Design an enzyme around this catalytic site. Structure first.
Site, PDB file in Angstrom:
ATOM      1  N   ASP B  25       0.767  -1.229   0.000  1.00 22.24           N
ATOM      2  CA  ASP B  25       0.000   0.000   0.000  1.00 22.24           C
ATOM      3  C   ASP B  25       0.805   1.289   0.000  1.00 22.24           C
ATOM      4  O   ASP B  25       1.245   1.741   1.053  1.00 22.24           O
ATOM      5  CB  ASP B  25      -0.910  -0.050   1.238  1.00 22.24           C
ATOM      6  N   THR B  26       0.912   1.929  -1.162  1.00 26.46           N
ATOM      7  CA  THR B  26       1.652   3.189  -1.272  1.00 26.46           C
ATOM      8  C   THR B  26       0.932   4.353  -0.591  1.00 26.46           C
ATOM      9  O   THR B  26       1.536   5.392  -0.339  1.00 26.46           O
ATOM     10  CB  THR B  26       1.932   3.567  -2.743  1.00 26.46           C
ATOM     11  N   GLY B  27      -0.355   4.166  -0.298  1.00 28.30           N
ATOM     12  CA  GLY B  27      -1.148   5.192   0.356  1.00 28.30           C
ATOM     13  C   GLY B  27      -1.185   5.077   1.867  1.00 28.30           C
ATOM     14  O   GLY B  27      -1.930   5.793   2.526  1.00 28.30           O
TER      15      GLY B  27
HETATM   16  C1  LIG Z   1       2.315   5.147  13.989  1.00 31.35           C
HETATM   17  C2  LIG Z   1       1.278   6.229  13.884  1.00 31.35           C
HETATM   18  C3  LIG Z   1       1.580   7.146  12.709  1.00 31.35           C
HETATM   19  C4  LIG Z   1       0.647   8.341  12.694  1.00 31.35           C
HETATM   20  C5  LIG Z   1      -0.763   8.060  12.172  1.00 31.35           C
HETATM   21  N1  LIG Z   1      -0.763   8.001  10.710  1.00 31.35           N
HETATM   22  C6  LIG Z   1      -1.888   7.809  10.021  1.00 31.35           C
HETATM   23  O1  LIG Z   1      -2.986   7.635  10.564  1.00 31.35           O
HETATM   24  C7  LIG Z   1      -1.760   7.798   8.497  1.00 31.35           C
HETATM   25  C8  LIG Z   1      -2.082   9.181   7.943  1.00 31.35           C
HETATM   26  N2  LIG Z   1      -2.665   6.807   7.924  1.00 31.35           N
HETATM   27  C9  LIG Z   1      -2.504   6.292   6.710  1.00 31.35           C
HETATM   28  O2  LIG Z   1      -1.578   6.608   5.962  1.00 31.35           O
HETATM   29  C10 LIG Z   1      -3.560   5.265   6.285  1.00 31.35           C
HETATM   30  C11 LIG Z   1      -3.141   3.830   6.629  1.00 31.35           C
HETATM   31  C12 LIG Z   1      -2.831   3.570   8.099  1.00 31.35           C
HETATM   32  C13 LIG Z   1      -1.455   4.053   8.511  1.00 31.35           C
HETATM   33  O3  LIG Z   1      -0.562   4.115   7.638  1.00 31.35           O
HETATM   34  O4  LIG Z   1      -1.271   4.387   9.702  1.00 31.35           O
HETATM   35  N3  LIG Z   1      -3.866   5.361   4.865  1.00 31.35           N
HETATM   36  C14 LIG Z   1      -5.080   5.088   4.408  1.00 31.35           C
HETATM   37  O5  LIG Z   1      -6.010   4.742   5.149  1.00 31.35           O
HETATM   38  C15 LIG Z   1      -5.294   5.234   2.894  1.00 31.35           C
HETATM   39  C16 LIG Z   1      -6.021   6.555   2.617  1.00 31.35           C
HETATM   40  C17 LIG Z   1      -5.497   7.713   3.423  1.00 31.35           C
HETATM   41  C18 LIG Z   1      -4.195   8.177   3.243  1.00 31.35           C
HETATM   42  C19 LIG Z   1      -3.676   9.212   4.030  1.00 31.35           C
HETATM   43  C20 LIG Z   1      -4.471   9.789   5.012  1.00 31.35           C
HETATM   44  C21 LIG Z   1      -5.777   9.334   5.198  1.00 31.35           C
HETATM   45  C22 LIG Z   1      -6.282   8.300   4.405  1.00 31.35           C
HETATM   46  N4  LIG Z   1      -6.132   4.102   2.559  1.00 31.35           N
HETATM   47  C23 LIG Z   1      -5.656   2.862   2.578  1.00 31.35           C
HETATM   48  C24 LIG Z   1      -6.692   1.795   2.316  1.00 31.35           C
HETATM   49  C25 LIG Z   1      -6.087   0.400   2.310  1.00 31.35           C
HETATM   50  C26 LIG Z   1      -7.174  -0.624   2.646  1.00 31.35           C
HETATM   51  C27 LIG Z   1      -6.853  -1.973   2.062  1.00 31.35           C
HETATM   52  C28 LIG Z   1      -7.369  -0.691   4.154  1.00 31.35           C
HETATM   53  N5  LIG Z   1      -7.568   1.963   1.177  1.00 31.35           N
HETATM   54  C29 LIG Z   1      -8.810   2.398   1.338  1.00 31.35           C
HETATM   55  O6  LIG Z   1      -9.277   2.711   2.438  1.00 31.35           O
HETATM   56  C30 LIG Z   1      -9.647   2.479   0.068  1.00 31.35           C
HETATM   57  N6  LIG Z   1     -10.688   1.472   0.146  1.00 31.35           N
HETATM   58  C31 LIG Z   1     -10.761   0.468  -0.721  1.00 31.35           C
HETATM   59  O7  LIG Z   1      -9.976   0.327  -1.660  1.00 31.35           O
HETATM   60  C32 LIG Z   1     -11.915  -0.508  -0.502  1.00 31.35           C
HETATM   61  N7  LIG Z   1     -12.753  -0.596  -1.730  1.00 31.35           N
HETATM   62  C33 LIG Z   1     -11.368  -1.891  -0.126  1.00 31.35           C
HETATM   63  C34 LIG Z   1     -10.372  -1.907   1.032  1.00 31.35           C
HETATM   64  C35 LIG Z   1     -11.062  -2.011   2.380  1.00 31.35           C
HETATM   65  N8  LIG Z   1     -11.728  -3.302   2.545  1.00 31.35           N
HETATM   66  C36 LIG Z   1     -12.769  -3.511   3.348  1.00 31.35           C
HETATM   67  N9  LIG Z   1     -13.272  -2.512   4.063  1.00 31.35           N
HETATM   68  N10 LIG Z   1     -13.311  -4.724   3.434  1.00 31.35           N
HETATM   69  C37 LIG Z   1     -10.251   3.875  -0.117  1.00 31.35           C
HETATM   70  C38 LIG Z   1      -9.159   4.913  -0.163  1.00 31.35           C
HETATM   71  C39 LIG Z   1     -11.075   3.908  -1.401  1.00 31.35           C
HETATM   72  C40 LIG Z   1      -1.706   9.180  12.619  1.00 31.35           C
HETATM   73  N11 LIG Z   1      -2.485   8.962  13.577  1.00 31.35           N
HETATM   74  O8  LIG Z   1      -1.682  10.251  11.973  1.00 31.35           O
END
Ligand SMILES: CCCC[C@H](NC(=O)[C@H](C)NC(=O)[C@H](CCC(=O)O)NC(=O)[C@H](Cc1ccccc1)NC[C@H](CC(C)C)NC(=O)[C@@H](NC(=O)[C@@H](N)CCCNC(N)=[NH2+])C(C)C)C(N)=O
EC number: 3.4.23.16
Lengths: 99, 99
Positions: B25-27
């Protein structure tokens, strides 16, 4: 181009006549754009991920230029934190993951 | 290898000695794995996704093999719908987005 992943893979996109910053997300099946008054026919949809679901408006056949690359497909518009370019459009611009 | 995106970029991983399937997951900034028993010390953390915020256990310096490639870093364990390998580990295996 080749995008390293030290930072979020953000690129400039064009949709509905507007330029926006969007995250290239290999983990997103769909493309979700922040709330915008996009004209056209739509149908309600619920999309999920980490944390739950959000209600969105599904627009079919929307053209989006991604980093100079033209694509056309289904775009979901709703209360998303960031603009997300999913696989439905990533495949269209020839994006791949390499390691 | 080069992974196209017509299908979800799923790979096999080995964590805690247990094999699992995970999405490149690049996102995702971080790597989030479904609830499981993982050897080691952890600290409570909160991450956010498309649908909201969830509570996770943060494990530092975890050895994990991703598609045959070794990485050692932060792994968050919690109620994620899918196991995701985020940028913190994608950079370790030398992954880049290309188009
Ligand atoms: C150690 C803590 C670090 C700090 C912490 N960081 C975060 O919360 C950061 C911003 N989060 C992220 O980067 C999170 C992943 C979790 C993570 O990495 O921690 N990324 C994400 O959640 C990104 C979108 C996003 C990006 C940036 C900001 C907000 C949202 N989505 C990732 C996600 C992967 C999926 C398989 C679970 N994809 C989706 O949610 C996409 N959904 C889909 O593709 C669905 N059709 C199917 C997947 C889900 N399946 C299901 N429900 N049965 C949607 C974008 C259309 C914080 N609290 O700020």
């Amino acid at each position: 181009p080749q995008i390293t992943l030290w930072k979020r893979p953000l690129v400039t996109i064009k949709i509905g006549g507007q330029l926006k910053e969007a995250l290239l997300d290999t983990g997103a099946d769909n493309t979700v754009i922040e709330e915008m008054s996009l004209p056209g026919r739509w149908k309600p949809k619920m999309i999920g991920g980490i944390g739950g679901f959000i209600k969105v408006r599904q627009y079919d056949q929307i053209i989006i230029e991604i980093a100079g690359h033209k694509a056309i497909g289904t775009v979901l518009v709703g209360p998303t934190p960031v603009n997300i370019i999913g696989r439905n459009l990533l495949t269209q611009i020839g994006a791949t993951l390499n390691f």
